Each structure stands twice: as structure tokens, then as C-alpha cells.
């Protein structure tokens, strides 16, 4: 018999992105080649099959630094991290290949789906 | 020029609630009289003006235990914590007064609004 506040989930995510922008309670740095990205482990796990696996691991759960595969593109990661915190994906002709490869590695199935559909439409 | 995934914010919140149920990466215990509630500080701040103030404080940000005012009803808190993690509010005749008082203390304006409207309709 619950009632539901439609905008609640979006409002929560907006405040989680505000915390990220202000670097409040971030508990991990994701290292992608020469670049570093601060984030909240809980948000990363909630969005990515890869981070969900990493941070449920009894040893990796306590690491403050995670190094991604050297093939991972920093811009692609940046675009996906922004998506995690906002629901918005900056998908462009010049970045689609890097975004799709990063989304496959991070196990973000909905992003992979759409990248596949956008590429198919251009061929 | 971003695209947006409609269900993303809800999917994130569902996974944050799964983390709470499994007690993964919870970093605070909220003590309400004889009862204890484990949660994630980031979610509490994202939902509540009171917790936002508490956890931006340079000393309170590092506490693992927060004791609420002894006037706070544990069931009312439980209902509001469930709401924070699900967008669903278990608002009933028998709990509405406690829920509204807890929501005022926690500074959860949308919940206070609806409690006010539901009480007004019964008078």
C-alpha cells in the first residue's frame, strides 16, 4: 500500500553527482593510463558488472586505487563515469568506438546496446 | 547532445538498496533509541537536509555512529530509511504522525508535504 515519489531516484542521483563534483566521501581513484578519476565505490558497483565484481571481492573491496586495463581509453571512461552519475551519455561519432569498448569492459549492457544500434544505423 | 537512459536512476537506487540489504560498504549506524540502522552516508546526505549537514561537518563526517534525538520514533525512521532507498513510502493512519515528525527532523520536505496533505484530507 506504499505511495511513490516519481522524482526521488533522479534527485538522489543528482545529489550523488554533486558529492562527486565536490569530492565528498569519494573512496576510490580509478586510474586509466595517465588519468585519474575519483568516485564512490557504491555508485560504480550499482552501474557496472566489472566494478560490482571488483568491490564484492574480499581483498579488492579495501583498495583505494584501481588500475584499469591499459587498452581502456580515458575519454571513454570519463563519458561512462559521467553517464553513471547522470543517466546522460555523450555519444558522438568521434567517441562511439571507445565508449562501446569501455562499456563492454565495464559490463554496462544498456550502453553497449545502444552503441551497437547507433553503429548499425551508420553502416 | 547527450542521449538519456530513462530507467538509469531507478536502477542505481535499486542496486544501492541491494547493497544496504547485504550490508555492503555501509559506513554508518544510525541509533534511534534501542534500535540500530546501517546505511551509506552518501545516500543519507542525498535524501536528508539533516544528514547532508551532519556529514559535511569536518568532525561528524568521520563518525561511524550517529545518535538521533530520543524523541525520534524508530518505526518512523525505518519507514523513511526504506523510502530513501526505494522512492516508496509506507504511509498509514497508524504511522503518519511519527513519519511526518521524523521527516521534519530529517528535513525531507517532499515527505513532510504529503504527510500534511494526507492529514488535511482526514480533518
Amino acid at each position: 500500500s506504499c505511495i511513490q515519489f516519481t522524482r526521488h531516484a533522479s534527485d538522489v542521483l543528482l545529489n550523488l553527482n554533486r558529492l562527486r563534483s565536490r569530492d565528498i566521501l569519494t573512496d576510490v581513484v580509478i586510474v586509466v593510463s595517465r588519468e585519474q578519476f575519483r568516485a564512490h565505490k557504491t555508485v560504480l558497483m550499482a552501474c557496472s558488472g566489472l566494478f560490482y565484481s571488483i568491490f564484492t571481492d574480499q581483498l579488492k573491496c579495501n583498495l583505494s586505487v584501481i588500475n584499469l586495463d591499459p587498452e581502456i581509453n580515458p575519454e571513454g571512461f570519463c563519458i561512462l563515469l559521467d553517464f553513471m552519475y547522470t543517466s546522460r551519455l555523450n555519444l558522438r561519432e568521434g567517441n562511439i568506438m571507445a565508449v562501446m569498448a569501455t562499456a563492454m569492459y565495464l559490463q554496462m549492457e544498456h550502453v553497449v546496446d545502444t552503441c551497437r544500434k547507433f553503429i548499425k544505423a551508420s553502416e | 547532445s547527450c542521449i538519456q537512459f530513462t530507467r538509469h536512476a531507478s536502477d542505481v537506487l535499486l542496486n544501492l538498496n541491494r547493497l544496504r540489504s547485504r550490508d555492503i560498504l555501509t559506513d554508518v549506524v544510525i541509533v534511534v533509541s534501542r534500535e540500530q540502522f546501517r546505511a551509506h552516508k552518501t545516500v543519507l546526505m542525498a535524501c536528508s537536509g539533516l544528514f547532508y549537514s551532519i556529514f559535511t561537518d569536518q568532525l561528524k563526517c568521520n563518525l561511524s555512529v550517529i545518535n538521533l534525538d530520543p524523541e525520534i520514533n524508530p518505526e518512523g525512521f525505518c519507514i523513511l530509511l526504506d523510502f530513501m532507498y526505494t522512492s516508496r513510502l509506507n504511509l498509514r493512519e497508524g504511522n503518519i504522525m511519527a513519519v511526518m515528525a521524523t521527516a521534519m527532523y530529517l528535513q525531507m520536505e517532499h515527505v513532510v508535504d504529503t504527510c500534511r496533505k494526507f492529514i488535511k484530507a482526514s480533518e
Binding site: C2, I3, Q4, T6 | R88, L89, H110, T114
Partner: peptide, 4 residues
């Protein structure tokens, strides 16, 4: 607020 809605009836979900």
C-alpha cells in the same frame, strides 16, 4: 506522489 503516485500509486505505483
Amino acid at each position: 506522489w503516485v500509486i505505483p
